[PDB]
Amino acid sequence: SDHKFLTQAVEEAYKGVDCGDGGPFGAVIVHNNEVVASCHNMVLKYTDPTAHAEVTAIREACKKLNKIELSECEIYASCEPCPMCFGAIHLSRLKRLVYGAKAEAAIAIGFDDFIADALRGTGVYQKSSLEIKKADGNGAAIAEQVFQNTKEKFRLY
Amino acid sequence: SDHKFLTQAVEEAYKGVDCGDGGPFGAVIVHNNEVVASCHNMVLKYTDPTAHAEVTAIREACKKLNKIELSECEIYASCEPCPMCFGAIHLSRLKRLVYGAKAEAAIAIGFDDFIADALRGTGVYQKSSLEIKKADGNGAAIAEQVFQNTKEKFRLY
Numbered sequence: 001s002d003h004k005f006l007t008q009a010v011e012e013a014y015k016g017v018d019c020g021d022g023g024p025f026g027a028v029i030v031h032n033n034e035v036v037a038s039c040h041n042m043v044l045k046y047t048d049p050t051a052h053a054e055v056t057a058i059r060e061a062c063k064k065l066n067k068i069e070l071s072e073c074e075i076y077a078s079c080e081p082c083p084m085c086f087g088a089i090h091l092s093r094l095k096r097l098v099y100g101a102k103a104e105a106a107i108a109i110g111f112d113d114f115i116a117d118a119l120r121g122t123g124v125y126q127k128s129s130l131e132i133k134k135a136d137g138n139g140a141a142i143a144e145q146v147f148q149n150t151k152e153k154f155r156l157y
Numbered sequence: 158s159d160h161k162f163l164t165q166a167v168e169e170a171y172k173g174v175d176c177g178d179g180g181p182f183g184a185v186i187v188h189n190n191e192v193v194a195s196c197h198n199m200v201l202k203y204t205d206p207t208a209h210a211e212v213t214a215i216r217e218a219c220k221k222l223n224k225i226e227l228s229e230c231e232i233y234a235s236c237e238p239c240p241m242c243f244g245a246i247h248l249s250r251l252k253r254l255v256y257g258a259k260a261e262a263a264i265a266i267g268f269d270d271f272i273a274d275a276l277r278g279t280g281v282y283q284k285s286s287l288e289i290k291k292a293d294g295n296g297a298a299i300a301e302q303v304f305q306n307t308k309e310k311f312r313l314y
């Protein structure tokens with residue numbers, strides 16, 4: 001299950017950067033193995049710097065389920081969510097987060113050094129008790145290669 | 158000019174609570190004394206937990222200026238922005254943030270303890286660069302009074 005949905009997020013990243021919607025980032029929100037939302041970064045398409053893949057997926061899933069909490073759903077991110085996106089995941093009350101690549105893989109291709117303290121447990125004020133799983137092995141390697149692969153295909157933002 | 162725009166953000170908070178759009182939070186984005194956006198929390202109206210006042214103001218200002226960065230603009234928040242909102246403020250490259258009430262004022266009336274380390278200067282992985290001003294005197298009094306005046310005028314989220 002984890003491998004399938006992380007793969008779907010990676011494919012969303014590739015698709016979004018291929019059609020010019022935004023950067024190579026994907027996010028899939030799932031409710032008991034039923035995909036509620038499958039989105040990618042829409043910053044360029046929407047002219048919205050908040051339209052990251054995770055925030056877009058949360059918005060879509062919440063309007064689809066007609067409620068502002070997703071306590072029965074889990075989110076799969078192709079890359080480690082940024083501070084804004086992790087805050088949005090916290091506010092969404094999503095019960096589990098699985099992400100593929102570490103943020104350093106995205107920083108390596110010139111992206112801003114923007115890492116969520118609450119995700120890595122390095123904060124004084126912001127804490128998290130959300131279940132967080134960093135993928136390993138297969139899906140992790142594939143997700144880390146995304147930034148070196150999608151790199152001549154978009155301009156940084 | 159700070160007091161005027163902070164008071165406008167507080168007025169937005171009151172209006173949003175009256176409308177039932179969301180909670181008592183407002184945000185005003187300006188460009189050299191010209192209001193670019195004036196928003197309040199729209200979580201209940203939009204069925205969107207990311208639709209905080211600050212995120213909504215950022216979206217609307219970026220739509221108005223036809224770009225994803227607001228380096229020439231400043232933001233006034235009625236209350237101390239949450240981690241998600243401070244991350245959005247960082248991504249939007251706003252040059253200055255002026256906030257009225259400390260987050261403890263919102264916590265005292267039933268909101269979650271959800272405080273941004275980067276705003277208070279305790280961040281390790283996330284480090285802010287923008288100028289930050291906490292309101293004093295009459296602006297602080299107004300922004301703090303917002304939560305005492307709106308208690309049980311809205312549904313908590």
Ligand SMILES: CO[C@@H]1[C@H](O)[C@@H](CO)O[C@H]1n1cnc2c(=O)[nH]c(=O)[nH]c21
Nearest residue numbers: 025052053081082085106111112114157
């Ligand atoms: C990586 O890095 C980067 C930098 O820092 C900035 C840019 O501007 O942000 C980030 N990003 C982007 N895109 C995205 C999504 O989609 N999601 C999330 O989470 N994040 C993100």
Ligand SMILES: CO[C@@H]1[C@H](O)[C@@H](CO)O[C@H]1n1cnc2c(=O)[nH]c(=O)[nH]c21
Nearest residue numbers: 182198209210238239242268269271314
């Ligand atoms: C304060 O407290 C609270 C809790 O914690 C959570 C909820 O759930 O968040 C927060 N909030 C709300 N609303 C809002 C806006 O509008 N803006 C911002 O910033 N923030 C916010």
Ligand code: NA
Nearest residue numbers: 194195196197
């Ligand atoms: Na408005």
Ligand SMILES: [Zn+2]
Nearest residue numbers: 052081082085
């Ligand atoms: Zn993000």
Ligand SMILES: [Zn+2]
Nearest residue numbers: 209238239242
């Ligand atoms: Zn917020």
